[PDB]
A paper describes a structure:
[name] limits the abundance and length of poly(U) within the negative strand RNA 5ʹ-extension by trimming down the initially synthesized poly(U) lead sequence to the optimal length that can suppress dsRNA formation but still serves as a template for poly(A) tail of the positive strand genome of the coronaviruses. Cryogenic electron microscopy (cryoEM) revealed [name] hexamer structures at 2.3–3.3 Å resolution at various functional states, including RNA-free and two dsRNA-bound states.
To understand the mechanism of poly(U) targeting by [name]-[name]-2 [name], we reconstituted a ribonucleoprotein complex of [name] and a 35-bp dsRNA substrate comprising the final 15-bp of 3ʹ-end of the [name]-[name]-2 genome and 20-bp poly(A/U) extension, which represents a coronavirus genome replication intermediate. To capture the RNA substrate bound to [name] and trap the target uracil base at the nuclease active site, catalytically inactive mutant H234A was used for the reconstitution. Although we added an excess quantity of the substrate RNA (10-fold of [name] in molarity), we only observed [name] hexamer with a single piece of dsRNA as a substrate-bound form. U/A pair was modeled at this location and the flipped uracil is designated as U0. A total of 17 A/U base pairs were confidently built for the consensus [name]-RNA structure including the 10-bp preceding the flipped U0 and 6-bp following the U0.
Numbering used by the authors:
A (entry chain A), B (entry chain F), C (entry chain D), D (entry chain C), E (entry chain B): 1 to 346
Write the structure that this text describes.
RNA sequence: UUUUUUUUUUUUUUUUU
RNA sequence: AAAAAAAAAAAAAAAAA
C-alpha cells in the first residue's frame, strides 16, 4: 500500500513492515505527506518508473551492506531475490524487475519459479534460507559473510555499499564471499583486481605507495618505486600542457591534481561502472579531454599490472580482469617504453 | 488506500468498502492498473487536486440520486456529510473539503465537530442518522424522500442527478424535500421556479406549451397562447438578422433553432449554474454573441413570469427566485409592450 | 530514429521504412512536427510508455487485419514476432515487449532466441517465413489465411481488427486458421463460440433471429422462438422497474433498449475482453447497476447455450468455451425453468 | 498580478508593491521571465500549490527577521495576518491559507473577520496596528520587539529566521516578546528551553562548555564538568562499535563526530521541528541507525535538564518544555546512573 | 537524430558527428538511455525548449573556449554561425535560434541567407571559412586568436569560458581579438574595462592591490594606496552596522567578507551580466539588502575609475565602458570626497 | 569485405603566433 | 620554433553492416 509505505517511511525512515497509514498526495513525480496540516516531500522520482512504484521500491531498498552495483553488473546479476538493490548513482533501482517485493514490478513471488530460472538471481547468504535457494537455482550469484559447505568461495572487494555509502566496514561486515552458478553449475570466479570506489573530494590513500604518491613529487615518487619507462608522468599524473588533456586515467592522480588545482569532472553517463568516463576540463591550465576513462585501481595494483606487461610491442589490447569482469586496456608501447596505458572500458 | 480503492473500482465500478488490493501505477495525472500484465486506465485527473486524492474522491462519489450541484450552490452548501458530491460538469468534487471521506481533504470525521459548525453541511436524509445530525447542526441543508417530524418541507425539483445523468426518476425517487438551517434556526425556503436541466441535443418537451412551441411556427404559437407584446420573437425565438445575435435566452429557443440548423455553443465557464453564459455562433447566418445568458426554465413558467410583470416601466430589474436563488432579469419595455427580457449582468 | 519515424508518419500515415527526417519536438507527452513553420500534433501518448517509445510503436503498428486483442489474450499470447499489435481500446500496444521492433522494448531481434522460448509468440502466416518460424517455436500462436501442411486448423472468428475497426472482410480476408503450440507440441484448440464485437450505437444484427429480436415485441419474439421458461424477459431484454437494474447481460438487449431509451455506459475497465463490465445507468427510469456483465454473443448461439443446459438444478456453474477461453455463467433455476443467467463473478 | 509580481521580483528581489509588468512564461512548474530575449528562471515550484500561486506567495514572503517555523508550529499558529511566512526547510509557505495576501489562498482580507476567529492568527507587533488587532483577536500569537501595555511578555529565542538564514541579529533585532490569546484570554506562556537551530557543517559553539566539548576528549570533558553517571559517552558522543548506532541524540555530538569523520544525514521528513529524525550512516565504521532523534539544545541546557532528573527510577518519561512545546524523553537508569536518554517515540 | 545525438553523447561526451544509435526514452523533460538494460539519465531539460531540441542543442554546444555570454550580449550578438553557445548560468542555449545546427531552431543553414542579414551573427575565426563569412556579413561579431588582414583588432578579456569554466588559458588561448560590423561597416569597438568573472567561494586575486586588500586590514590598505575620501569603507568593504546593508558593490569586498563570515547570496536573476544583483543577507550581523549591484572589476581598474572622477559635484551619473557596454554608476559626493558609488538603477 | 570508431606517436597541410 | 585547425601513417582491436 502507498499510504502504509509512506507511514513506514515517516516513522522508521524506510519500509519495516509496520501497520498504519498516513495522508499521501502525489503531484509532479513527487510523494508528499501531510504533517501537522502542511505537505512535506517524502520522495522525488528520479527514475523512469511510476512515482508510486519507485517510491515503494525505494522504501523497500536494502539498508544492509550490499555489493556495489558495478560488482553485480559485472557478474551478470539480472534480479535480486526478495530484496531491492538501490542504485544511488542513478537514484533508481539497480534492476528492472523484482521478486516478491512490488506487485507492479514482480515477475514472481519466489526465485524458484520458472520465470526466474533463465535470470541470474542475486542471493544474500545473510538472509535465512537464501543459501539453499541459491543451491537449487539454475543461474544466480550468492554472497555470504562466511563459508558455504561444499562450495569454493571467491573473496570479493573489501568494501561494500551501505545506504549509498561505500565503506570498508568495521562495526559491520562488508567483505563477502562470492559464488556463481551458470546453467546449474557452480562457476569458478577468476582472480581479480578490485576498484576501491573512492571519491575525488574525499580521497584517502589505502597503501604506503599511495601516501608517497600524494606527498612526494613526480620525480621523487617515480625514482623511489623504479617506475621509469612506464609513462607514469602522463598515465597517472596527467599532462596539463596542451589543449587536449594527456593521460590522467587513475583516480589517485585526479585526486592529487584536485588537491592543488580543483577542476571539473562532467559525468555524462552517471552510473556505477568499473571504468568511468569523464569530460574533464582543467580550470587552471585549460586542458580538457572529452572522454577521460578513469579507473579506481589501487596504485600498487596498477603498478603491478603495468609492470606485468611486455614492453616490446608496438601496440596491443591488454585484458585485465577487474571487478569480476574483463577490462580491456590500450597499451601503446614505443621503443621498449610505455607511451600510454589507459582503461578503455565504458 | 490507493490500491484498495482501485480494487473496489475494478471489481465494483466504485468504492464499496471491500477488502483487497490491485497493482496501481500513477503517471501523468492518470491512474493505471495492471490487468493480465497490461496497464489499463482507471482514472484521469481533471481536477486541481492530487491525482490519488481525486481518484479516491471520485471512487467514493455518491452514486445515488443527488440534488444537482446548482441547487446545492444556491442553498449555500459548503460541504457534504460523510459523502462526496461529484460535479460531472467540472469532472471534480463539488466541494473543496470532505467530512470523513478522504484523509487528505477531511476537515473532520463527523459533522458535529467545531470545524463544521460554521459551514453549511449537506445532510442526506436517506442515510441513517443524518436527520438527527441535521437537527443538531448549526448550519445545514437536509434532503429527504419523505416528511420530517416537526419540519415543514420544501418540495424541490422533480429531477435529480444520478451518476451525472439528470433525470426524473421512475424506478428511483428523485424528488426531495429540502430543509435548511442557518445558525441553528430552521429557515423557510422561498417558493421558487426550477430549471429543467435539459440538454440542447437531447431536449424533450415537458409540457403541452413546449410541444406546441417546437411544432408550431412563430406566429401560430404566439397567437395561440396570447403572447403578443412580450417580444417572444426575440427573447425566446431569437433574432439572427444582424451580426450580433439577439435574444435567445431560453434553452427551448436554442433547441428549436438547433433542430432546423445546428450551431456552436462555447461554454467558457464549464460549471453548473442556474443561468448559463454561452458564446453562440450561428453557422447558418453568421450571427454571434460573445455572452448569451441561457436559462432552462419551463416554457409555462417563463410565460407566467413574463406575464406577471408590470409593462408600464421603461427599465426595470425583475427579481425572480429560481432554484432557491434570486435571479435578476432586466426588463425593457416601450408603449406597453416588452422589448427585452434577459438575465442581467449576463 | 524518432525523426525518421515521424517522417514516415507524415508522408505515409505510418512506418513504411522510408528514408528521410522531419523536425520533431516532444512536450507534454506529445509528439509535434513542424509543417510550414508551425507545430502540428502527430501523436499524444495515452500509454505508460515513454512518449517517443509509444510513438515509434504506434507508427510500426500492424495495419493489416489482425485478430482482436481479446482473442490473443485468451490464447495466452505474450508477444508478437516482428510486429506491433495495437490495442485501440486502450490506445496502447497490446504487449509490453516486442521482437525486433523497438530498441527500448525489444527483448530479442528474432523470435527464435532463448528469451522467446518460454513466451507464447504470435506468428502471422501472411508474412513470409513466419510459418516455419512458428514450426520452430517452443510456444507460439500462428494465424494463416489458408491451410498449413501437417497441421490441423482451427477456424477463428469471421471478424478481425483493421486499424481499430472490427469488420468481416469482403475486399480482404479476416477469417484466420489458428494454430497453437505449447512446449513444442501442437495443441488441439477447443471448439468455441465467438463474440461478435459489435457496438451499442452502431449495432447491426447478423442473423434472422436477431432481426426478429430487434423489430418484434418481447412477447411476440419469445412465443415465436419457443423461448418460454428461459427468463429471456430478464436476461436479455432487461428489467428497469427497480432502482437496481436486472439482467441486460446480452449486448443485443442493450442495443434494443438504447434504440428506444438511450442510457449511459461507464466502462470503468476500458480494455478488450470477452466479457465486459459496465456501470449502466438508465437515463429514462433511473434504474442503475454498478457492475453489468455484457457478452456480445450471437443471439442464436446464446439461445443454443441456454437451451443446452439442464433446467432441473437450483444453482449450477455453466462453463462455455467462448473466444478460446472458458466463460463461467451463473445459472439459477426454479420449477424447471431459468431464473437468471449472467457471467459469474461479474 | 503574475506579471507585476515577476516585475517586482526582477527589479527588487521580492514583491515590494511597485507598478510595472514583465513578460512571464510558465512551463514545467517553473516561472520564467524574458530578459533581453532569453528566458530566465525566476522560481521553481517545490510546493503542492499551483506554480503561479506559489510564486506570488514566495514574492510576498516576509523578509524581516521572523520566528522560526517550529516556534510558530509549537504555538499552534495556523495562519499569519497580512504576511507570508516562508518555510525554507520545505521551500513552501508555512501555512496553507493567508489573510489578505493571495486571492487564490486568502480566506479573508483582514484578521477581524469571522473565519479567522477560530484560528490562531500570527500577529507581528513590528507592523503598525497589529497589536490592536491581536488585542481584539479571539485566538492569536503576537511578537513584539518591546513591551506591550498591560500584557506580560514571554521572552523568545535569541535567534530568528532572516530570509531563510537563522541568526542572532546584531544590526537587527531577532529576540521577540511572545504573547498568546486562546478564546479571548491572554495565556501565560510556560518557561521553556530553546533549541539553537544550528547546522552540522557550520556548527559554532555558543557557550564555554560547548567549546570544551568540541576541543577536549571524552574523558577530560566528562571529568571536568562532573558528568560521571549520565552516560554522556553514548547519549552525546555516540557509540560506533556495533552495527546499530547508539545514542548521538544531541547535534553537538553529531558535529563533533563530523569534525573528525564526516557521515551522512538522511532527513526523510525535511521540515522544521524541535526534534529531528535522521537516517544516520557512519561512513568510517559502518554504524547506522534508521531513526536517530537529534535535538539542538544548548549543552548547558541539556546538562541542566539531565541533572534535574531523578536517577532512582528504572524507566521514566521526562516531560521537558522546549520551544514552547512539551518534548518527551525516555529516561533509563540502573544502579543510580543514567543508561539512556533520548526523545520519546523517536 | 535523437538516438544518434545520444549515441554521440554516450561515446564521446558531446556530439562529434559519429554514426550510430542508442535506445532513448524521454520522460519528465529528461533524456534517458539504456545501458546494460537500465535507464541512465543523459540530460535534464532546464530550458523553455522541447526536451529533445534542448538535448540536441546541448550535445552540439561549443566545447572550445568561447567568449563569456555577457560579452556577446553586450556586443548585441543575436545568433551564432554553425555553432551553439551554451549559457551555463541559465543552463540553456545563449541564443533562441541557430544557423545550421538544429532543424527545430534553425532559421537558416548558412549565415549568408537573407534572414541572418539583420541579425548580428557571431563568427569564430578559429573555424575555417568564418572570417570570410564575417567579411561578407552585414552585421556580425568575429573573434580570432590572431590578426586579420585589413581589420583593426579589439583586444578582449584575458579569460574565456571553456565547458562552463571561466579561466585564463595556459594550455589554450582564451584572449581573442574582437571585430564588429554594423550594416556592413567595420566598427571601432570602444576602449573598455573587463570584469574578471570570478566566484565568491573561489576568489583568487589577480593583482598586488587585490592581494594587499585581502591580507591587510581596511585602514592599512586605505592608507597605503592613498584611498582616503573615496568611501572605500562602504563601497568595497561594506557596512554591516544597520539593518540595511551598505555598499558592497565590488566582488572583492564580498569575497573578503565571505572569508571571515560566510553569508547568503540570493541570485534572483540567474543569468550572465556585467552587473549582478543579489539579495544579500549577512548571517553574522543580520544586515540585509534586497538588491545589491555587484561588479567584478579588477580592484586596480576600479581605483582608476574612481580616481578619474570629478569630486566637486553633488550628484553625478558616471558612464563607464565595461565589457563593451556602458555601465551607469551613481556618484554621490560631499565636501570634495566620495560618499557613495554604485551602479545606478540597481 | 564495407563504413565508422578508439583518451599513441608520427608525418603532411594550413593558418596564427 | 611552436600552437592549433585539416589530412594521412604505424598498431591492436570494437562493432555493425
Amino acid at each position: 500500500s502507498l499510504e502504509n509505505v509512506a507511514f513506514n517511511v515517516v516513522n522508521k525512515g524506510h519500509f519495516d513492515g509496520q501497520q498504519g497509514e498516513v495522508p499521501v498526495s502525489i503531484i509532479n513525480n513527487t510523494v508528499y505527506t501531510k504533517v501537522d496540516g502542511v505537505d512535506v516531500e517524502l520522495f522525488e522520482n528520479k527514475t523512469t518508473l511510476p512515482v508510486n512504484v519507485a517510491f515503494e521500491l525505494w522504501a523497500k531498498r536494502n539498508i544492509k551492506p550490499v555489493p556495489e552495483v558495478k560488482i553485480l553488473n559485472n557478474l551478470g546479476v539480472d534480479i535480486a531475490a526478495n530484496t531491492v538493490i538501490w542504485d544511488y548513482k542513478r537514484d533508481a533501482p539497480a534492476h528492472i524487475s523484482t521478486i516478491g517485493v512490488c506487485s507492479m514490478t514482480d515477475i514472481a513471488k519466489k526465485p524458484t519459479e520458472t520465470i526466474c530460472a533463465p535470470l541470474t538471481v542475486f542471493f544474500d547468504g545473510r538472509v535465512d534460507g537464501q543459501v539453499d535457494l541459491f543451491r537449487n537455482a539454475r543461474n544466480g550469484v550468492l554472497i555470504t559473510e562466511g563459508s558455504v559447505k561444499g562450495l569454493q568461495p571467491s573473496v570479493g572487494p573489501k568494501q561494500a555499499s551501505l545506504n549509498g555509502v561505500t565503506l570498508i566496514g568495521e562495526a559491520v561486515k562488508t567483505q563477502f564471499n562470492y559464488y556463481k552458478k551458470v546453467d546449474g553449475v557452480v562457476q569458478q570466479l577468476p582472480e581479480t583486481y578490485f576498484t576501491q570506489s573512492r571519491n575525488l573530494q574525499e580521497f584517502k590513500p589505502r597503501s604506503q605507495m599511495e601516501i608517497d604518491f600524494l606527498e612526494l613529487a613526480m620525480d621523487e615518487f617515480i625514482e623511489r618505486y623504479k617506475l621509469e619507462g612506464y609513462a607514469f608522468e602522463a598515465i597517472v599524473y596527467g599532462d596539463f600542457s596542451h589543449s587536449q588533456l594527456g593521460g590522467l586515467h587513475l583516480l589517485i592522480g585526479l585526486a592529487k591534481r584536485f588537491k592543488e588545482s580543483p577542476f571539473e569532472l562532467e559525468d555524462f553517463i552517471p552510473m556505477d561502472s568499473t571504468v568511468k568516463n569523464y569530460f574533464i576540463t582543467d580550470a587552471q591550465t585549460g586542458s580538457s579531454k572529452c572522454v577521460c576513462s578513469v579507473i579506481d585501481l589501487l596504485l600498487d595494483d596498477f603498478v603491478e599490472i603495468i609492470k606485468s606487461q611486455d614492453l616490446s610491442v608496438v601496440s596491443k589490447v591488454v585484458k585485465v580482469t577487474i571487478d569480476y569482469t574483463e577490462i580491456s586496456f590500450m597499451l601503446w608501447c614505443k621503443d621498449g617504453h610505455v607511451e600510454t596505458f589507459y582503461p578503455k572500458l565504458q
